[PDB]
Design a protein around this ligand. Structure first.
Ligand SMILES: [Cl-]
Ligand SMILES: [Cl-]
Ligand SMILES: [Co+2]
Lengths: 275, 9, 100
């Protein structure tokens, strides 16, 4: 399963200059392009090696369109400020996300496009890619505006055509980095307390993509309720990590089994602490 | 490939 | 307005060993608005030349960043991450536990 996404964030800062605009494109969990208005010379820049082969026409076109997005979004910031009758001295955040998901057969399974204002859902394109859902009475103005312009038609065209096509291209060009399935390196750690109890921590390291399932078994039973699970985190080298801990009665460690499920895995593995 | 235009809200 | 305080994790890229230089990470996520201050401390000493990944955000709209820097673990050297955000009345510090 694969997907391509583009995100953007426009952040006003009255008194500290023009609103900052950042835009970025991801293939799955890998960022491959980035634009930042705070750069000395704003432009769409590569963030992955496999996109660096695109010629100057590509970068020239991406940078030009993205600079246009920035201008449209700075204007949006300020239409919304009007809609909510907010102070000209206040700071606000407008976020955007658009993307296409490809099934395991390689054809479109779903596309989107949504907006959030000050951390709240604002406007979203519906699954049918032909209608919109407004989160409040301000967003309804935007919704009516989009409907009157029949813009959904153009967004759908991108999601069904360009998005899928280029995702397929990036997947091929960065095949070694993108269509790879590292399996996580796993092990369980033992942390005693004196005679009564010990913490068993199940580790999953160096895996990609970030999607993974960790679960603890005691004679073949999930413990979800008393298991502390940390948010999956980036190692910093392109892989992810995650651990699941469970406090068990001393002397019964062997009754617990960790269940790890990752795509790079050929079969879900089961770990058990080594004495 | 980013979509050409951003939406006007 | 919506206000989400940052979630913080302090960890190393590879298993802690005393003597080997590794990577000290401080993953800050789930926060909003996007403004945030993050420093990596060494025995209370603010570490310089610390880098961070590009500001981005998750599906739920919350922002996330990864601050890092090369380092060498030690039985006596205590490493931590200092984070300040509008949601915090005072800066928050999370110490690096090589076991987490
Ligand atoms: Cl608030
Ligand atoms: Cl509120
Ligand atoms: Co509030």
């Amino acid at each position: 399963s694969h997907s391509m996404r583009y995100f953007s964030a426009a952040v006003s800062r009255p008194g500290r200059g023009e609103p900052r605009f950042i835009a970025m494109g991801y293939v799955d969990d890998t960022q491959f392009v980035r634009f930042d208005s705070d750069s000395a010379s704003p432009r769409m820049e590569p963030r992955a090696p496999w996109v660096e082969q695109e010629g100057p026409e590509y970068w020239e076109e991406e940078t030009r369109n993205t600079k246009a997005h920035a201008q449209t979004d700075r204007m949006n910031l300020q239409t919304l400020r009007g809609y909510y009758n907010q102070s000209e001295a206040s700071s606000h955040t407008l976020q955007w996300m658009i993307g296409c998901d490809l099934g395991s057969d390689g054809r479109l399974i779903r596309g989107y496009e949504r907006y959030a204002y000050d951390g709240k859902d604002y406007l979203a394109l519906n699954e049918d890619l032909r209608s919109w859902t407004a989160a409040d009475t301000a967003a309804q103005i935007s919704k009516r505006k989009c409907e009157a312009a029949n813009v959904a038609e153009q967004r759908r065209a991108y999601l069904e055509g360009t998005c899928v096509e280029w995702l397929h291209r990036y997947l091929e060009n960065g095949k070694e980095m993108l269509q790879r399935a590292d399996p996580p390196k796993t092990h369980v750690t033992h942390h005693p307390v004196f005679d009564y109890e010990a913490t068993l921590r199940c580790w999953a390291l160096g895996f990609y993509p970030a999607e993974i399932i960790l679960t603890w078994q005691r004679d073949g039973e999930d413990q979800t309720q008393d298991v502390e699970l940390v948010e999956t985190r980036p190692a910093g080298d392109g892989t992810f990590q995650k651990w699941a801990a469970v406090v068990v009665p001393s002397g019964e460690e062997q009754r617990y089994t960790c269940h790890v499920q990752h795509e790079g895995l050929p079969e879900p593995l089961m770990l058990r602490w080594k004495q | 490939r980013i979509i050409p235009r951003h939406l006007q809200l | 307005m919506i206000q989400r305080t940052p979630k913080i994790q302090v960890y190393s890229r590879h298993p802690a060993e005393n003597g080997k230089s590794n990577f000290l990470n401080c993953y800050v996520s789930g926060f909003h608005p996007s403004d945030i201050e993050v420093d990596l401390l060494k025995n209370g000493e603010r570490i310089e030349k610390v880098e961070h990944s590009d500001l981005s955000f998750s599906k739920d709209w919350s922002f996330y960043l990864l601050y890092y820097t090369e380092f060498t673990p030690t039985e006596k050297d205590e490493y931590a991450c200092r984070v300040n955000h509008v949601t915090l009345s005072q800066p928050k510090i999370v110490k690096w536990d090589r076991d987490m």
